[PDB]
């Protein structure tokens, strides 16, 4: 039939894939090749990566997909394909770190100017648009406090003023949020997170209209970034995404239990999780997201030293900066990642001294809660 | 000891690699991971790719290496790290195709201007340099007639006028040519060709000073192209380069036999191969290159239709646009790759209607010569 | 801590694995090596496969694990380690096909005699035991009608008469059944099915006492079958088993829905599924198994030609002889696998002309039911 | 054409392989699958492993090939397919270690008796043959002193008395010796050594008549050992064997240089290498082998402690028990492998206290000789 007609779990398993016609092999073969041969002068890929691109296009409800070497390369291949010297971008402030350096330093050195705004306030996006604006760029939920962006409202604003909307959907995966259905033009992912889900692949994906994807492929990849994804990485990502539906269900079930535990804990001052009623944009989240996600941020009493003591006291949670793996991962941005940054700068970059970020995995939630309770008790 | 002190074949086998300290594993483990874990807050890669980078740095006699997703990404990560709007590049005209589009269209849209010159004439390079020139870019030997560029002379010119020299060494590999030893600042490769050699990896490498490579890594890769190489691709390239010395010796031994056969054939009007005395820059080749290479170009009598008939008549040689594999590969640019291009344009892009390009593999040269003789006889 | 102390889902994720001490890599590195190096004469693996063996030992609650090249090799390495000429085996009749040939022909040619019994009747096992009996061998649930064997009762019988009990736990996985906890001495799996779960690995595992596993390793593998598992296959199986808990939950949830649908369908004469109340050993199943499994057998009205027409009319279910993959798979033994076998022989081997076997995958059960309903309607 | 008609180097590159018809992929795809799908009931592998089997069959000049999980499994799958209780085997004494345990202990426990003889004396083979003898089994060259066996003469003897001849050709590879051309019936290899050559694959291969190979596959593998090779291991072996010709040429060129150096060294009492004129079977070697091999044994003055001191003093050669890798490997059996064995037993098992075994790699021979000279000087 047509894979676009089946239920979402069926699509997760089947879309973009079929038994090998030649051999009947059910698994997508790994076409680990660089060389393709022609039969004739007149009549003179990659099939593995093509399957991944088609599957993700189906899952995001877009026309076409393009796999890349990294999440970074998905974003830069996209924006460098769309923009040239003299052009302008309006970008959310609450965005991924390496994206910020690309937008803050790299783009301006190529004559491409960027205005950063608080995208939780759609009026700030509107006010920053210029005749030269080609692209509005947002991420949602956004780090570090998991604030949201109203995709449908921002898309309407962008389009009225003649710009494209590009959305980073990494945190959600297509299982939980579909920006193209809400009016975005282009979706990008780091598949490194939930789409692969197994913490063993660095890669990205771009999904959008065929017309744009062809330009991203034949100009962006070929003539600017060279950021192709290897066939083995595509095969692993295909393998990982088979369990996307059941993984996201369990991630989100576990995260909600852990978030409620943290909200009831007197040593925890704040808990940021879209699944909690006290989230500032809770109702927007319920319309825009099918599940509240696997990521939690929370603030422990006692600031910087309590945060340090807490992550040094966990025994099951692993200390790492990654997200979306099968293992529960924990990090303390003020002592770890943003440690060279001046306090007052971190402080309304949104990173308080006591802020902890947690990527909830597939372990028994009882074991994770026990580990957290033990570490919090010690840290305070 | 120090791997920088052993003979070149010993370095090919050993440089950048050692038994795994933890386990004693002799093969470099495949660190197929995205996530790395920290032991503490205070104390809070990729090891496979690191081994490849160190090996190639040793082989090129450079300080440091940086692996990339493709040969394209090696070149663009390099140039986009070095140049910003307002800067200038002097580039050889006789360069790889996708490189030309990057230099002709992409760079100028970022405000970076490029002048193309005939790099076989070092005076044209000098005459094109401007106060804004940051980089001189060359490839040697160069397609399609395997003309050469005098690296040492061009390096001297570039440096006197305050620019860096970047050399694409893909065609030669470090076994046959070492541009850094001749004064180049930066070497780039598509490892897709001879360094891997097995036609199953797309990838690139950049080699140069530690100071530059750190910028290419932490700014170029991280903040512009995102073009990282996957650990499995790095492991395969490490595996392939183990036989670099013995592969290049046989490629070049076979190519010289085939080139001499073609030079004696009355249906072949011209043969381009640096190992032949009639090559226009033969003596330069003997000083600059340790072996004349595995690539041959030649012109068959009868123009476009003879070229078409010839490649349609080979039965052992395979029709493909790739180079540097273990199989002998053949292509006819006028009918294949550059077929949409207007004849008169191709004609002193250097591509005549009868031009055939041959990548000589590891087969018995007698079998390749027999296949060629048969196909030439039919085609004419 | 000790991985033997956490909840089962936590064990699935973490047991046998830890961040690489040397590098911090979270994923288990792929030690694709044959050679291990020594530091000295005095002081003169595989680490990937070791992680898999330790994980499965923890999940089955056994002391030690041994990975093999195939499910077949797990069974034969076990039995050939335990038995020599003159010894005797009592085996269930309702067993996997290739196992039957090994037991029926191969063992007797080595002087090892085998008696086959109906293991659903523990008294038949007792009556077949001899002074020479070393091993009782069973599989449960058993094909093709998913009959059960009471592991605890059979273990007691075997042990009283001085024999070991070996159980094939492939159909269940350790998530759903733990034979060692019920008194079995040794468990074997084809990891090809649910433990890997992704239809891309052929492999086996043996779990039991350290004393036995050492003999299976240093004598069975090294000196009889040579059936080692490759490190890459072990790494893929480690990756697959990460989602074992969530996969089995969904397989079993989907299978129960599909089984109830089939039980209500007037064109379906019988449905065999341990989760249905009418299963002959339903209560035994509830004590012995935590979930009823992902495999269903059923008989369609109209015998051989209806069965043929049905499998030729499915459009989502895939025709294959495999089990335990993420895709729903279907087969018709009488027309497919056992087609060369005489009808009357198949008929109380348990294989009726109308019998269909179904491996339920991770698709939306509504889509699978719709596909089945369509195919059944056509077939009848 | 027919790959059986090209030169041996051409066969090494091309035999068993072709561009993928479906996609044009030049590299053999990795069919990492367990499941194969059928299109119909009526019409209801592995393609990667099949390519390897066909290539090695062509190279050994046999009809068919069968890949296995290990060299051990190649040997045991073969012999257990051929022999049953009551049968007899005549085997060389000078054979690989794990093979000896299989033949000495395992076979007799299955009622299969084995007589061990000195196969350098063909008359000992004849004298040991019995009416029950099914197989004569030899290895050549043989460890540890690299003695030879006259394959053609032994084949004639075996056949006159109605037995098959099985030859282990691991040490030589098909590039240097072709036992089937000399009258052997069956050839086995550990591909772990030279056929793969890169020290990262454990695997075996069996080559012989189609009639036998079908029995080894459908009975030996399926119903006795279960020792299949994984598709990824087959793909790596295919990749490794591409350079077999150029690797063996360099291994043997380097080994001859090193052997001549050792023969001239006054601290070295004996050197065992078929390429040296003083080898006891030198002329037989020249008829039977195209090159003298990459393996050298030699005795250092001063017995056990000198041998220990020597291997502890090398700085380039690596200490390991493996053979046939790209790195030079060294071992001292009396202190390392056979250390638990009583001296007088080792002593005319052929292992003297001063015996060193060397696997010569692809490094510059000057560097290896320098390392050896340094270590020998220290050790004495
Ligand atoms: C991690 C991340 C990226 C970058 O992904 P890589 O594959 O590591 O480059 C981009 N966007 C978001 C939202 C991320 O979390
Ligand atoms: C093929 C080639 C490249 C590009 O390599 P990819 O890995 O295919 O991007 C660059 N330079 C030269 C000289 C080449 O031949
Ligand atoms: C498939 C199967 C086996 C054999 O597994 P392989 O890995 O294919 O050898 C053994 N036992 C049972 C119960 C099976 O279903
Ligand atoms: C190493 C070796 C074997 C066994 O090979 P594995 O792949 O390690 O089982 C068999 N025969 C010979 C001659 C060997 O050297
Ligand atoms: Na699939
Ligand atoms: Na190595
Ligand atoms: Na892990
Ligand atoms: Na090939």
Strand order across the beta sheet in which D318-319 lies: D268-272, D295-300, D355-359, D329-331, D318-319
Residue C374's alpha-carbon distances to B344, C331, C378, in angstroms, are 62, 16, 6
Residue B333's alpha-carbon distances to B93, B337, C117, C240, D130, in angstroms, are 17, 5, 71, 46, 68
DSSP B146-161: TB---HHHHHHHHHHT
User: What is the number of other CB atoms lying within 10 angstroms of the CB of residue D7?
Assistant: 15
Q: Which residues does A323 contact at the CB level (< 8 Å), separation at least 6?
A: A171, A193, A194, A294, A295, A329, A359
D226 and C73 in contact (C-beta within 8 Å)? yes
Query: Half-sphere exposure of residue A291, counting CA atoms within 13 Å on the CB side?
Result: 21
> First CA to last CA across chain D, in angstroms?
59
Same structural domain, C162 and C17: yes
Same structural domain, B98 and B80: yes
B131 is written with which tokens?
A: 């106060």
Q: Which residues does C323 contact at the CB level (< 8 Å), separation at least 6?
A: C171, C193, C194, C294, C295, C329, C359
CA D156 to chain CA mean position, Å: 22
Q: How far apart are CA C193 and CA C176, in angstroms?
A: 14
Same structural domain, B214 and B83: yes
C344 is written with which tokens?
A: 């009357």
Residue C351's Cβ-count burial label (10 Å; 0-12, 13-18, 19+) is: buried
Best CA proximity match to D28, nearest among D231, D246, D245, D243? D231
Best CA proximity match to B30, nearest among A233, C321, A175? A233
A171 and A141 in contact (C-beta within 8 Å)? yes
Q: Which residues does D1 contact at the CB level (< 8 Å), separation at least 6?
A: B315, B316
Tell whether A306 is within 8 A of chain C (Cβ): no
Are D33 and A21 an interchain contact pair (Cβ–Cβ within 8 Å)?
no
> First CA to last CA across chain C, in angstroms?
59
Dihedral sign from CA coordinates of B71, B72, B75, B77: negative
Q: Dihedrals φ, ψ of A10, to 5°?
A: -65, -40
Are A243 and C243 an interchain contact pair (Cβ–Cβ within 8 Å)?
yes
Best CA proximity match to A48, nearest among A69, A36, A33? A33
**Does B342 reside within a domain?**
yes
D79 and D137 in contact (C-beta within 8 Å)? yes
Residue C141 CB less than 6 A away from ligand 3? no
For residue D209, the SS3 value is coil
Alpha helices by DSSP H, listed for B333-379, are 343-347, 365-379
Are A243 and C247 an interchain contact pair (Cβ–Cβ within 8 Å)?
yes
DSSP C201-237: ---EEEEE-HHHHHHIIIIIIIIII--PPPHHHHHHH
A166: which strand partners?
A137, A186
**Does B17 reside within a domain?**
yes
Q: How far apart are CA D262 and CA D373, in angstroms?
A: 9
C114, C120, C123, C124: CA torsion to nearest 10: -30
Q: Dihedrals φ, ψ of D17, to 5°?
A: -125, 155
Same structural domain, B280 and B190: no
- Parallel, antiparallel, or unpaired for β B268-272 and B295-300? antiparallel
Instruction: Give, as one character, the DSSP assignment of residue C199.
Output: S
Distance A57 CA to ligand 5 centre (A): 16
CA D262 to chain CA mean position, Å: 24
Residue ending a domain, among D197, D229, D244, is: D244
For residue C27, the SS3 value is coil
**Does B37 reside within a domain?**
yes
Residue A269's Cβ-count burial label (10 Å; 0-12, 13-18, 19+) is: middle
Q: How far apart are CA B34 and CA B16, in angstroms?
A: 22
Q: How far apart are CA A35 and CA B329, in angstroms?
A: 10
Dihedral sign from CA coordinates of D33, D38, D39, D43: positive
**Structural domains of chain C, count:** 2
**Does A333 reside within a domain?**
yes
Atom 8 of ligand 1, nearest CA residue: A71
D90: which strand partners?
D115, D136
List, in sequence order, every beta strand (DSSP E) within A186-319: 186-190, 204-208, 268-272, 295-300, 318-319
Strand order across the beta sheet in which C268-272 lies: C268-272, C295-300, C355-359, C329-331, C318-319
Return the axis-axis angle of helices C47-60 and C231-241, rounded to nearest 10°. 40
Strand order across the beta sheet in which B133-139 lies: B64-68, B204-208, B186-190, B164-168, B133-139, B88-92, B113-117
Residue ending a domain, among D191, D219, D244, is: D244
Same structural domain, B131 and B153: yes
Same structural domain, D319 and D343: yes
CA C46 to chain CA mean position, Å: 24
Best CA proximity match to A225, nearest among B76, B206, B78, B112? B76
Query: Which ligand lies nearest to the CA atom of residue A327 in the structure?
Result: 7
Same structural domain, A79 and A121: yes
Q: How far apart are CA B376 and CA B262, in angstroms?
A: 10
B213 is written with which tokens?
A: 């490579």
B153 and B131 in contact (C-beta within 8 Å)? no
CA B104 to chain CA mean position, Å: 20
**Which protein residues have a CB closer than 5 Å to ligand 7 (ion)?**
C 17
Q: How far apart are CA A336 and CA C292, in angstroms?
A: 46
Query: Half-sphere exposure of residue D43, counting CA atoms within 13 Å on the CB side?
Result: 8
Distance C196 CA to ligand 7 centre (A): 15
Cis peptide before B27 (omega within 30 of 0): no
A347 is written with which tokens?
A: 């402080």
A227 and B227 in contact (C-beta within 8 Å)? yes
Q: Which residues does A283 contact at the CB level (< 8 Å), separation at least 6?
A: none
Contacts 24+ apart (CB under 8 A), B214-221: B214/B64, B215/B81, B216/B66, B216/B77, B216/B78, B216/B81, B217/B66, B219/A106, B219/B81, B220/B77, B220/B78, B220/B80, B220/B81, B221/B66, B221/B68, B221/B77
Residue ending a domain, among A197, A215, A244, is: A244
**Does D261 reside within a domain?**
yes
**Does A237 reside within a domain?**
yes
Query: Which ligand lies nearest to the CA atom of residue B233 in the structure?
Result: 2
**Which protein residues have a CB closer than 5 Å to ligand 6 (ion)?**
B 17
Tell whether B332 is within 8 A of chain A (Cβ): yes
State which H helix or E strand residue C13 sits in. helix C8-14
Residue B204 CB less than 6 A away from ligand 2? yes
User: What is the number of other CB atoms lying within 10 angstroms of the CB of residue B287?
Assistant: 9
**Does A1 reside within a domain?**
no
DSSP B163-206: -EEEEE-TTT-TTT--GGGGT-SEEEEETTTTTT-SS----EEE
Q: Which residues does D369 contact at the CB level (< 8 Å), separation at least 6?
A: D257, D258, D261
Same structural domain, A284 and A165: no
> To which residue do tokens 């019920």 refer?
C182
Same structural domain, A39 and A163: yes
- Residue of C45, C226, C230 to mutate, ligand 4, most atoms within 8 A of C-beta: C226
Residue C8's Cβ-count burial label (10 Å; 0-12, 13-18, 19+) is: middle
Q: How far apart are CA B350 and CA D123, in angstroms?
A: 71
CATH code, domain carrying A47 = 3.40.640.10
Binding residues of D for pyridoxal 5'-phosphate: 71-72, 96, 190, 192
C267 and C376 in contact (C-beta within 8 Å)? yes
Q: How far apart are CA B15 and CA D327, in angstroms?
A: 12
- How near does any CA of chain D get to the CA of C281, in Å? 31
Q: How far apart are CA A88 and CA A99, in angstroms?
A: 16
For residue A251, the SS3 value is helix
Cis peptide before D143 (omega within 30 of 0): no
Strand order across the beta sheet in which A355-359 lies: A268-272, A295-300, A355-359, A329-331, A318-319
Distance C374 CA to ligand 5 centre (A): 23
Q: How far apart are CA D352 and CA A231, in angstroms?
A: 51
Q: Dihedrals φ, ψ of A270, to 5°?
A: -140, 150
User: What is the number of other CB atoms lying within 10 angstroms of the CB of residue B175?
Assistant: 23
Residues of the domain holding D319: 245-377
Q: How far apart are CA B159 and CA D370, in angstroms?
A: 41
Residue C1's alpha-carbon distances to A93, A371, D95, in angstroms, are 41, 11, 47
Same structural domain, D152 and D290: no
Best CA proximity match to B232, nearest among C235, A71, C20? C235
For residue B32, the SS3 value is coil
C181 is written with which tokens?
A: 């906890």
> First CA to last CA across chain B, in angstroms?
59
DSSP C313-337: T-SSSEE-S--S-SS-EEE-TTTTT
Q: How far apart are CA B109 and CA B103, in angstroms?
A: 10
Query: Which ligand lies nearest to the CA atom of residue D52 in the structure?
Result: 8
Same structural domain, D267 and D213: no
Instruction: Give, as one character, the DSSP assignment of residue A187.
Output: E
C199 is written with which tokens?
A: 């239809």
User: What is the number of other CB atoms lying within 10 angstroms of the CB of residue C139?
Assistant: 24
D270: which strand partners?
D299
For residue A133, the SS3 value is strand
Mutate to test the interface with D, among A14, A32, A45 (most CBs of D within 10 A): A32
DSSP C240-293: HHTTHHHHHHHHHHHHHHHHHHHHT-TTEEEEE-TTSTTSTTHHHHHHH-SS--
Q: How far apart are CA C317 and CA A10, in angstroms?
A: 11
CA B339 to chain CA mean position, Å: 24
Q: How far apart are CA D70 and CA B47, in angstroms?
A: 29
**Does B1 reside within a domain?**
no
Are C239 and A327 an interchain contact pair (Cβ–Cβ within 8 Å)?
no
For residue D242, the SS3 value is coil
Q: Resolution in A, one decimal?
A: 1.7
Same structural domain, C104 and C56: yes
> To which residue do tokens 């076998």 refer?
C341
State which H helix or E strand residue A233 sits in. helix A231-241
Residue A3's alpha-carbon distances to A48, A203, A206, in angstroms, are 18, 24, 20
- Residue of A78, A100, A192 to mutate, ligand 1, most atoms within 8 A of C-beta: A192
CATH code, domain carrying A328 = 3.90.1150.10
Tell whether B313 is within 8 A of chain D (Cβ): no
Which residues in chain D precede a discontinuity of more than 2.5 Å between C and N? 44
């Amino acid at each position: 039939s047509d894979c676009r007609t089946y239920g979402f779990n069926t699509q997760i398993v089947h879309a973009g894939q079929q038994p090998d016609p030649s051999t009947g092999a059910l698994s997508t073969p790994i076409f680990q090749t660089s060389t393709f041969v022609f039969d004739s002068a007149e009549q003179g890929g990659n099939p593995t990566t093509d399957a991944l691109e088609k599957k993700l296009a189906v899952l995001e409800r877009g026309e076409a997909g393009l796999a890349t070497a990294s999440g970074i390369s998905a974003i830069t291949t996209t924006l460098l394909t769309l923009c040239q010297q003299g052009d302008h971008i309006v970008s959310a402030s609450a965005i991924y770190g390496c994206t910020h350096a690309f937008l803050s330093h790299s783009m301006p050195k190529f004559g491409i100017n960027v205005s950063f705004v608080d995208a939780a306030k759609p009026e700030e996006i509107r006010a920053a648009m210029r005749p030269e604006t080609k692209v509005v760029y947002i991420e949602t939920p956004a780090n570090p406090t998991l604030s949201l962006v109203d995709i449908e409202t921002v898309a309407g604003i962008a389009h009225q003023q003649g710009a494209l909307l590009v959305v980073d959907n990494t945190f959600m995966s297509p299982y939980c949020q579909q920006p193209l259905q809400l009016g975005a033009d282009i979706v990008v992912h780091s598949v490194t997170k939930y789409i692969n889900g197994h913490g063993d692949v660095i890669g990205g994906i771009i999904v959008g209209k065929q017309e744009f994807i062809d330009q991203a492929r034949f100009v962006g990849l070929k003539d600017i970034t060279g950021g192709c994804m290897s066939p083995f990485n595509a095969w692993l990502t295909l393998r990982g995404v088979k369990t996307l539906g059941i993984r996201m269900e369990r991630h989100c079930e576990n995260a909600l239990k852990i978030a409620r535990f943290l909200e009831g804990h007197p040593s925890i001052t704040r808990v940021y999780y879209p699944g909690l009623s006290s989230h500032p944009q809770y109702e927007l989240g319920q319309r825009q997201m099918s599940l509240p996600g696997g990521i939690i941020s929370f603030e422990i009493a006692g600031g910087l030293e309590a945060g340090r003591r807490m992550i040094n006291s966990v025994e099951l949670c692993l200390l790492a900066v990654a997200l979306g793996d099968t293992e529960t991962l924990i990090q303390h941005p003020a002592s770890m990642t943003h440690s060279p940054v001046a306090p007052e700068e971190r402080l309304k970059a949104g990173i308080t001294d006591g802020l902890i970020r947690l990527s909830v995995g597939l372990e028994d939630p009882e074991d994770i809660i026990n580990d957290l309770e033990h570490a919090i008790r010690k840290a305070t």
